[PDB]
Design a protein around this nucleic acid. Sequence first.
RNA 1: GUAAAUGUGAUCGAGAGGGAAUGAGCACUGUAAUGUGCACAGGAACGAGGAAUUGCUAGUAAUCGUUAUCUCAUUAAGAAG
Lengths: 144, 151, 117, 142, 76, 192, 65
Amino acid sequence: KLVFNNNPLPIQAMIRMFNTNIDGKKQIIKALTTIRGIGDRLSLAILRRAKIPTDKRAGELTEDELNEINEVILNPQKYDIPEWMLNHQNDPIDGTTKHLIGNQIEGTIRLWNERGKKIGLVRAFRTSLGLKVRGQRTKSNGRG
Amino acid sequence: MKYNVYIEGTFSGIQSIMVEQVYPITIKCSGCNLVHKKDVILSIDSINYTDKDEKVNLKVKCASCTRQMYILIKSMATELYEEKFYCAKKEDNRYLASQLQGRGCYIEKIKDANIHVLSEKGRIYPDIVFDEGYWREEDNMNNTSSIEDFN
Amino acid sequence: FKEFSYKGVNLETLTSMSISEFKELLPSKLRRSINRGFSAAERDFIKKCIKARSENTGLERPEQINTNTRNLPILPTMIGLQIGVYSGRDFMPMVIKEEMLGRRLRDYVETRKLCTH
Amino acid sequence: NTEIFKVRHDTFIPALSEYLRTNKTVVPIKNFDIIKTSRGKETSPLDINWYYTRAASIIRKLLISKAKNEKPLSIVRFSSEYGCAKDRGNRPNKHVRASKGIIIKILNDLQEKGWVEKKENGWTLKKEAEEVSKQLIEKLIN
Amino acid sequence: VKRHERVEDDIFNKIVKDVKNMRILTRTTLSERYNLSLNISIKLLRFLEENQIIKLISSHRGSKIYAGSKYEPLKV
Amino acid sequence: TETSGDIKLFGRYPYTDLEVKDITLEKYINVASKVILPHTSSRLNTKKFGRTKIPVVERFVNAMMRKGRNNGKKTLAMRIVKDAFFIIEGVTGQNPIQILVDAICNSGPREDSARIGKGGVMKRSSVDVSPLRRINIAIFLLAKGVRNSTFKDIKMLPEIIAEELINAAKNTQSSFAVKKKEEIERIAKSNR
Amino acid sequence: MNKQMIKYNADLETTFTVERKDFGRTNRRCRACFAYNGVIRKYDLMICRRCFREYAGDIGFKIYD
RNA sequence: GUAAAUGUGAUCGAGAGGGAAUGAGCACUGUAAUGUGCACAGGAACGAGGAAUUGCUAGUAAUCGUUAUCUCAUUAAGAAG
Ligand SMILES: [Zn+2]
């Protein structure tokens, strides 16, 4: 009898990367947009340096494929992803550039805003009260 | 026509039921017997007037026969809790929230009412949501408040 | 505990650098202001700061320096000084602490009182 | 004769693309696998060989320009040819050019292979680049 | 229940038996009768049109239409 | 390319031996005018019965340029109906054109409700529709049924066109257009 | 007038001169009435919309359509 | 900065629609950024709108871009074509 020979592999329901859960049925691109700090654009960048076919689903990936992606997230600058692609450029505290993942984002924004408030930076005071800081008009819109 | 709005059910651990006097209602014209194409919001705070300067809470023209339709809410509340909440009047095993007075229309359905609960322990549960006609809450002292068979 | 640092540089080194060198650290819009050269007003303000840091000795505070140079970025030469910045109505006083580097003097003063209805 | 018009574009652009890659006549820009073609585009291309489809379509623009005896093609002309409508949030969509860097690299690659000659007011074909196209078409229609 | 990302052996077997005697069939039928997603209704349908079990009758833009063993066209 | 013969619709369909099959409708349905593509710019709308001389499938594509966002997109409508005719010709086995004709015949309500009272209150009554209004409503209902059916459903729009038109031609309860024709006629009778 | 300003470089010792660009309302006053608002700048007129309509027929403008 | 809707092929698959508040940056206009562009993030309401209410009869209404038109150093989500 004939056989299909074009079927996906036996698939797992969901998997863990980053203290984050990824739906195994979801195709790798929109699936890596679950981890904070991996947007659409950067998700495609990582996958083509780890060299994984974009059309596989997240639950088909081996441990090996998940290590390849895990390695590229901890150190993008090693696999020729240039610094203008990354979250945190010319860090005031370190001089360096780095890519913040998961809960690091909120923690870094907090420690930053808190420092400005300790010394009375007007920009930080407004964000704490729920006000706007990019010059937007606050009379007509943005109520409640 | 006059309609009483009751809150019916089995009440446990409840001191008072409070009701927002805001009713999404289906109305039928008493002239041409046609149902209004959309539900209308009937609110106690809506101020309208008949063509004889009588206060009403809703004034709607029938789209088919052009007849005017009017509804007045009479709150049956015995008191205002925190000057905001209409305490429904307890009547045996139910609560009388309001009386709706229709002229030129029938009220066919009240869809929903926003309900708040005051427990026997003096705790307020605002904007309670029923699941399949049931609501239940427990406090930090293990006192239960519940409503079962809500209608 | 570690020394104060701005974009990699220690306060000891930072207080010794020329304005031309400090320019390699600052944000883009602040750099463009220093590349386009100082006004005659700004030069007097800066020369007074350099004089003051030099002149002051012991435990007595130097006198306040007032300015309407609102857009000037804060420089490592006015650290520890008391400076009055014009608010459109009055010279609002402040002390220039280390953590203010990389910002303009207008960022620390309100020209409009906060609103509470 | 104007030999190019005798075959369909969606058969010619794919056909030449293979002849390019099997001889490596054009070399990819650094980071071609993650760069976008314009600031108007949403994501990078779906085909890894997009750089070669650009090279194949650039020589087509030049063949038809030569066929109609137009003035030579400039870097600005090509940038408006490949342009698109950019998405701007809460605002109308707006026409924007292609990025020049890709096009410059392709034209400098083709110069080194002797396929494209720089004139004072634009770029132009050369005998070898014409004859490759001629000899392809003569098989492809048959 | 949600849709599926495999055509397992016993679904595959019965689809062959079901595709004969059907007339025009399309991406939706495989995905609304059985539980397959659109991304696996395309792949199975394309496979059967290589195996000569079905035949393609239109493919204009992405709109794509097929026929099974009891199709019969008009005649002049 | 495909043919060097006589004019056929989409270059495929016979364009002859067509019967209306309701004498009340005869004069108002143009199946005469041989056109290769359901498109004309003929400026008949500025006339007294000129909108009854426009060809049938033309009137039928115009009905698709709706829901606001699709205004003016007449090419898109032609693309859609072309495919539907392939589905229908296959399914039915007969000239898609006779399916379309019979869909119209069944789907127009014959009696309707209206206000008659002039010198007093306006009281509703039954009234009898003209030939022209009867066909105008048929197209309207067939269109409205299709549009709303496809909105948030996975099925392809050209397929929904084939579902409705077959059923309508066959006068089955299955058609949205046919059901609503029954409703209007029942209410008309209630007010008789 | 094209006014000039001195500016100091980062050394606060070397000086250079830069020119102020003429822009905004300050030099585009209505040639009939000195107004700063509603000035028509086209065809090298410099006349406000109020003044234009009384003089238009003397200049030679007409409403044809 | 010399159309866009649009035409063909791929792709994605029912909050992969949507881009609001915000971070460390990288440039431009300018006497001065507080204004504008760019890259990387981040990812709010909103799932078709109560009582009411406004135009429109044919190349009209609605859709789609564009202004060597007006404002204009830099700024259009405005008018007038
Ligand atoms: Zn004037």
